[PDB]
Design a protein around this ligand. Structure first.
Ligand SMILES: Nc1nc2c(ncn2[C@@H]2O[C@H](COP(=O)(O)OP(=O)(O)OP(=O)(O)O)[C@@H](O)[C@H]2O)c(=O)[nH]1
Ligand SMILES: Nc1nc2c(ncn2[C@@H]2O[C@H](COP(=O)(O)OP(=O)(O)OP(=O)(O)O)[C@@H](O)[C@H]2O)c(=O)[nH]1
Ligand SMILES: Nc1nc2c(ncn2[C@@H]2O[C@H](COP(=O)(O)OP(=O)(O)OP(=O)(O)O)[C@@H](O)[C@H]2O)c(=O)[nH]1
Ligand SMILES: Nc1nc2c(ncn2[C@@H]2O[C@H](COP(=O)(O)OP(=O)(O)O)[C@@H](O)[C@H]2O)c(=O)[nH]1
Ligand SMILES: [Mg+2]
Ligand SMILES: [Mg+2]
Ligand SMILES: [Mg+2]
Lengths: 136, 431, 49, 430, 431
């Protein structure tokens, strides 16, 4: 919503004379101003709108927050301790948790329904091959 | 869009099934309860859209006792309630029962479930199968599970970690019979399989963990360790990646020869791990140590065909590249003529997660190798001798005739081994 | 050139809000999670009662 | 004007692709976010070559990242300077190739390769006057070798008068990476020699000798590795983008490096490179650049370049240096080593000068030599490749994707002839 | 400004209306006392000016016990005191008794109440009649009632829910006779009636709800949910709304065939409800799964004429056509040639309200399907034969002939069956 968008045709018509009649620079200086003037053309849009090693991330689970769950069945005494379960009986400690992580992320891969095939009609124009000036 | 769906059939699988998850669970910030207390768990667990992470596993077993352990165990909340299909009568080590009488009316249920799992994960890479060959159930249902799958969908790649009987130690007395018959089913339906003899681990158990009284609970953990290495590159970041679809394309010289035996290192308990620098060069050699082999063999008795070994940890391309440099020259490791370059190298940065309550002492480097060498024939030729001994007088043959199998089934199977046995000799002859 | 500064920002300024709009859903998906998190906890025990 | 469109193919090239744009990005002074902050007036004279223009004055590279697996693509953005790439040009598959050529050149590559076919026409067309194409790929991988070769094949089919270049990494037998390296690599070049205008050979092994002999860095890494070429790639286009005494356009170099249509495998290298500890010590002058440019170890291929001779080679001297000195030393070398240089093509080195050096150094040179040494590379690749086939080892795979043994048969022949047709000039005399 | 009137009789009407009214009250926040604790409610309640709110329903029945339970139960205050027209003597499963003998002395009272109830409303769209067919309890009253309503009102649409007897499980022993006559009455007097045979639920209940001992109270709850799903579009905001009158113009291909069969999903218990995402993608397929059909009939054995299946919840409209497209491709699934499209898709937002103490577990998404499939002939065929078996030697016929029925009625009723079967066969053939 910029006021600078509604400028319609018929308004470019004569708007006085931007420079005054008393401060016209002589030809000599103008020959020297080209370098500065051109740069503004290239970077003015550039100045306004334009503006290593692998590192690991922290492991998702915090050591202090294991929250070990109790078994569903009610074992009474150590006698019936069956080896088939002694898996996961020990909660992780600080030593066990790995020190570094190197994730693989495909958030940029889980997209792109398919690659594009543009079924258009030419529309590229031919510029001629040598000394653009003889090209229609 | 990359995952792995696990199929386990047989009591040995279920017990091994638990072992794998404890190693997997702790490496990705998941507590026992299954409730979380960026996207790195997509390969194994399928997001529900709100709440729990679901294991992508299916457990099959025809006996309820072992399953009865899981559904009231510490991992009670984890697995989905309606995916642990179970039977009512145990096969009783009879391979026939799992292939002609009882398996028929439970095969469907497994078939019905499987299609649902592929309905959610988008880019299923392959199916991992862990089974005990030397059992009536595990050999039976596990065998049929491969038959439909090979035809159910098509050219999907599959992996299987079998458990063949030990040379001088065995549990049952019928393992030689059913195991040989099992080979035929597995020879023409799976791209890759790994020898997993029990005896070796104990010997690996004796020196390294310094535990003189190991139990299967200790046994299971190490196997689950290999699972981390082979599929490690799927869900992490590294300087060079490897994928399942790129394994059976580079470790199979010919379509028939598809038995490669694994070896894992190192194994040094925390009681003494702190007196060796754990240099990469020393570890690299340690893997190829003849006796240490995870399997029932002395590769000094044969050549090598293809060694695709994957490193993990803080490995560097120089630390590995020089290491392979020294290995090639040695006299005690000889390569076949027609593969002058015979290694595939990977890299994964994740330090090897150490399970609590275990034995492994955490180190900054690790290596797991999967190499298919001609020396595999020893078990096949060796196992043949026991099979020859019994069938001669038709001992124990009487019941397999009682489960509906025709007698001719036995005769056909043996011929396959010799052809497989013969082929191994042929490819091994230098040109 | 002095003219082109404003409109070239026009896209820039008009597009930051959408980044906030992407935040709109960001707040959004709390609805089910807060819905499933607590409200179901009671229902789980409701069969228990 | 006379701009190029960069097209990467394969995971290897992507890693090179990132640093090259990363390395090239610094030279002009384009910040990571896309906001220019350059200092020199010269730094923006020819920005058109590697940067477009859109709303806001931002700049986006004219690159198309093509790979059949997502894993490399995901990581490629997250690093530095990754936001330069336009999101709308990425193309990626959902199956993968598994280092098997056939899956990536006849079954899967073609279907998805239309998209990369679609985009490439877009990028090339926009520029005022196209100057040519450059493509990087890893022949050691099954996927790129098939899709990458196909894209090269179509491009020549679509724009005859342009020029296509290739930076090639060919497996060295000493250091192995892929059990199928002998199979694919030898096969792929068969199409490469026919259509590709220029192919630059760089060996992974040589990359490593420079680090452990001259650079004297303790723990080399791909980032150390990939950087080397990126600067090397920086030199090849350095003269094209800035002023110079004798501007040397992309074809300018081609004009003096291809004696015959089928000899289009040059090999280049970058220098100088002095140990960090000693850098404060070596003498920096025009001559010194020559010791490390013709040096055996500084040139980045496995074959020792002294076992044959030079058919034709020239160096693009860059920086401010007296032009008499550059010529005098050039004829200086071509005088007292005649044994290594053929006799029926006189004064067989070209000269080039540019006035802007990379940031941090005064004078350096980039060399591109067509040395007869390259005969060795194919032989070892041929030697192993020939051996594997007789037994039909690992032949069922490629036979399972519409291929035949016949296709395998023909390609082996072309290498043998190609190698033969290259060594002939070695013994040729006038 | 839009209204609907509810009519119930005996078994079906009474004990389906109970549950449907608890569901409606729970949804709208109308407590059992009728006082609203501090505008969508209009379509099922009428204003009392101050305090309570009286549902627009009229309960009709001949046997006092079931109705009498309503006047003294926890919902005693709810229904209008004088709308519970109660009989004095029971019909005793006799269709003739409930249609010519004792029904006359109650139709007069039943209609006048209908007249007064309709008077207050201003936006009458249709009548929801939930009547019992196999239950001689009410069939006789039900058959006559619709007949009078037709000539009395005219073009106003009518909807009925008949619960036919299961192919194998049945309660009464004279059911085959009573249903066949009732079908004749509904034939030319009803517009839309849905098959809801009890058998499926018994199969449905133990399949999903996880209650090995289901009961009637379990059975009724499910029917109530269906009605809420059908009607919610009328009484709550919707992007693409469908009203009561927009069914008979979209599911009745011809004036003759005016029967359809429904089905509901998802159904799952909270004990295992949320181990999955319950993605809208999967729910659509299940609705068409034969194993969950709301009626004991197999759609695989017949074609499809038109399926107007309704969504409810927060279903993204785009996914709606995303899921449907897959349905068509799939393959004793296919639609008749002359049906280019038989789908009426409408989306409503409000999530279903789940009553505490029930079995159904709420979710963010749900769907109720109403598809008419040619397989409907099976229920008629099986019942058509059964009538033949008994009537072969006039079993029980004397009792019906003794209540004023003319012996010629049965023959003309039988001729009705053949006409419907022949019409179905003719319409099921391709061109
Ligand atoms: N290493 C190891 N192997 C085991 C373990 N438990 C079972 N096994 C294997 O399983 C075999 C025992 O028979 P199983 O195949 O497990 O019996 P099952 O799985 O119930 O199948 P059926 O015998 O047919 O009922 C042993 O020979 C082992 O090889 C274990 O804890 N560790
Ligand atoms: N004396 C002198 N001669 C020059 C100088 N620069 C270029 N030349 C002459 O230019 C010749 C080579 O051609 P260039 O000037 O590089 O340009 P060109 O002839 O158009 O060739 P291309 O543009 O590269 O196709 C040399 O042989 C020189 O004689 C210079 O600074 N001093
Ligand atoms: N679903 C349901 N079924 C019922 C109910 N009450 C009785 N039934 C049984 O459902 C069967 C068929 O249902 P109906 O159409 O209601 O037949 P009916 O009116 O009950 O005929 P009667 O058995 O004489 O009462 C009957 O044989 C009853 O045994 C009820 O409240 N709900
Ligand atoms: N220059 C360079 N080459 C590499 C690097 N990593 C791997 N390679 C080579 O690339 C080959 C594998 O190519 P790859 O990345 O798989 O390409 P892809 O087949 O398209 O996935 C291996 O044989 C390596 O020798 C690297 O960091 N730099
Ligand atoms: Mg067992
Ligand atoms: Mg010139
Ligand atoms: Mg009754």
């Amino acid at each position: 919503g910029c006021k600078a968008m509604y400028q319609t045709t018929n308004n470019d018509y004569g708007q006085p004379f931007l420079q005054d009649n008393k401060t016209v620079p002589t030809y000599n200086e103008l020959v020297e101003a080209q370098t500065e003037v051109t740069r503004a053309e290239k970077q003015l849009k550039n100045k306004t709108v334009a503006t290593n090693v692998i590192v690991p991330k922290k492991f998702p689970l915090k050591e202090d927050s294991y929250k070990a769950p109790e078994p569903g069945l009610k074992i009474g005494n150590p006698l019936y301790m069956t080896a088939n379960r002694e898996y996961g009986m020990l909660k992780p400690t600080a030593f066990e948790i790995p020190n570094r992580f190197y994730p693989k992320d495909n958030t940029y891969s889980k997209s792109f329904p398919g690659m594009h095939k543009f079924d258009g009609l030419n529309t590229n124009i031919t510029f001629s091959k040598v000394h653009r000036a003889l090209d229609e | 869009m990359r995952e792995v769906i696990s199929i386990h059939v047989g009591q040995g699988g279920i017990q091994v099934g638990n072992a794998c998850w404890e190693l997997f669970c702790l490496e990705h910030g998941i507590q026992p309860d299954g409730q979380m207390p960026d996207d790195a768990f997509n390969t194994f667990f399928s997001e529900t859209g709100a709440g729990k992470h679901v294991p992508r596993a299916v457990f099959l077993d025809l006996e309820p006792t072992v399953i009865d352990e899981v559904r009231t165990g510490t991992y009670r909340q984890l697995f989905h309630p309606e995916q642990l299909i179970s039977g009512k009568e145990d096969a009783a080590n009879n391979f026939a029962r799992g292939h002609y009488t009882i398996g028929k009316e439970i095969v469907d249920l497994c078939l019905d479930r499987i299609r649902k799992l592929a309905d959610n994960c988008t880019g299923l890479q392959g199916f991992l199968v862990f089974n005990s060959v030397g059992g009536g159930t595990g050999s039976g249902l596990g065998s049929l599970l491969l038959e439909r799958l090979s035809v159910d969908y098509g050219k999907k790649s599959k992996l299987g970690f079998t458990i063949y009987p030990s040379p001088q130690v065995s549990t049952a007395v019928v393992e030689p019979y059913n195991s040989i018959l099992s080979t035929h089913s597995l020879l023409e339906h799976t791209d890759v399989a790994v020898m997993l003899d029990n005896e070796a681990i104990y010997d690996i158990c004796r020196r390294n963990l310094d535990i003189e009284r190991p139990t299967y609970t200790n046994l299971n953990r190490l196997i689950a360790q290999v699972i981390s290495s082979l599929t490690a590159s799927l869900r992490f970041d590294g300087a060079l990646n490897v994928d399942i679809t790129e394994f059976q394309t580079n470790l199979v010289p010919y379509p028939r020869i598809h038995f490669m035996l694994s070896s894992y290192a190192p194994i040094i308990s925390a009681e003494k791990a702190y007196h060796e620098q754990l240099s990469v060069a020393e570890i690299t050699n340690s893997a190829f140590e003849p006796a240490n082999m995870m399997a029932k063999c002395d590769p000094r008795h044969g050549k090598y065909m293809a060694c695709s070994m994957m490193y993990r940890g803080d490995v560097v391309p120089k630390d590995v590249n020089a290491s392979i440099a020294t290995i090639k020259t040695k006299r005690t490791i000889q390569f076949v003529d027609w593969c002058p370059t015979g290694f595939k190298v990977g890299i994964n940065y994740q330090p090897p997660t150490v399970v609590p309550g275990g034995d492994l002492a955490k180190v900054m480097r690790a290596v797991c190798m999967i190499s298919n060498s001609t020396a595999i024939a020893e078990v096949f030729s060796r196992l043949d001798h026991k099979f020859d001994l019994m069938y001669a007088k038709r001992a124990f043959v009487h019941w397999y005739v009682g489960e509906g199998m025709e007698e001719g089934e036995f005769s056909e199977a043996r011929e396959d081994l010799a052809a497989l046995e013969k082929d191994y000799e042929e490819v091994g002859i230098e040109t | 050139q002095t003219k082109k500064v404003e409109a070239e920002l026009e896209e820039n300024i008009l597009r930051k809000c959408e980044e906030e709009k992407r935040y709109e859903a960001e707040k959004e998906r709390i609805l089910n999670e807060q819905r499933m998190q607590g409200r179901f906890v009671l229902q789980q025990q409701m069969l228990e009662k | 004007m006379r701009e190029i469109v960069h097209i990467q193919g394969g995971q290897c090239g992507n890693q090179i692709g990132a640093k090259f744009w990363e390395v090239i990005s610094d030279e002009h002074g384009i910040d990571p976010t896309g906001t220019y902050h350059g200092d020199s007036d010269l730094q923006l004279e020819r920005i058109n070559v590697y940067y477009n223009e859109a709303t806001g004055g931002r700049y986006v590279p004219r690159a198309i990242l093509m790979d059949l697996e997502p894993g490399t693509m995901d990581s490629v953005r997250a690093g530095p300077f990754g936001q330069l790439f336009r999101p709308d040009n990425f193309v990626f598959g959902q199956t993968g190739a598994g280092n098997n050529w056939a899956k990536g050149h006849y079954t899967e590559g073609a279907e998805l390769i239309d998209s990369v076919l679609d985009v490439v026409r877009k990028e090339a067309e926009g520029c005022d006057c196209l100057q040519g194409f450059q493509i990087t790929h890893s022949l050691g991988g099954g996927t790129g070798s098939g899709m990458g070769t196909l894209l090269i094949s179509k491009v020549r089919e679509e724009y005859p008068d342009r020029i296509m270049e290739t930076f090639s990494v060919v497996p060295s037998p000493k250091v192995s990476d892929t059990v199928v390296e002998p199979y694919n690599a030898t096969l792929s070049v068969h199409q490469l020699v026919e259509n590709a205008d220029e192919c630059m050979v760089i060996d992974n092994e040589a990359l490593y000798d420079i680090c452990f002999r001259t650079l004297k860095l303790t723990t080399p890494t791909y980032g150390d590795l990939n950087h080397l070429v990126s600067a090397a790639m920086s030199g090849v286009t350095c003269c094209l983008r800035f002023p110079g005494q004798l501007n040397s356009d992309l074809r300018k170099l081609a004009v003096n490096l291809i004696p015959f249509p089928r000899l289009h495998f040059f090999m280049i290298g970058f220098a100088p490179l002095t140990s960090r500890g000693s850098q404060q010590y070596r003498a920096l002058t025009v001559p010194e650049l020559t010791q490390q440019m013709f040096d055996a170890k500084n040139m980045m291929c496995a074959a020792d370049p002294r076992h044959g001779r030079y058919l034709t080679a020239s160096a693009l001297f860059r920086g401010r240096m007296s032009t008499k000195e550059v010529d005098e030393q050039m004829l200086n070398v071509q005088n007292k080593n005649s044994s290594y240089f053929v006799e029926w093509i006189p004064n067989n080195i070209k000269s080039s000068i540019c006035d802007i050096p990379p940031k941090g150094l005064k004078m350096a040179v980039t060399f591109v030599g067509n040395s007869t040494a390259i005969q060795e590379m194919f032989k070892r690749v041929a030697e192993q490749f020939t051996a594997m086939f007789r037994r039909k080892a690992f032949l069922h795979w490629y036979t399972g994707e519409g291929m035949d043994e016949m296709e395998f048969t023909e390609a082996e022949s072309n290498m043998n002839d190609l190698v033969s047709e290259y060594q002939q000039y070695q013994d040729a005399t006038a």
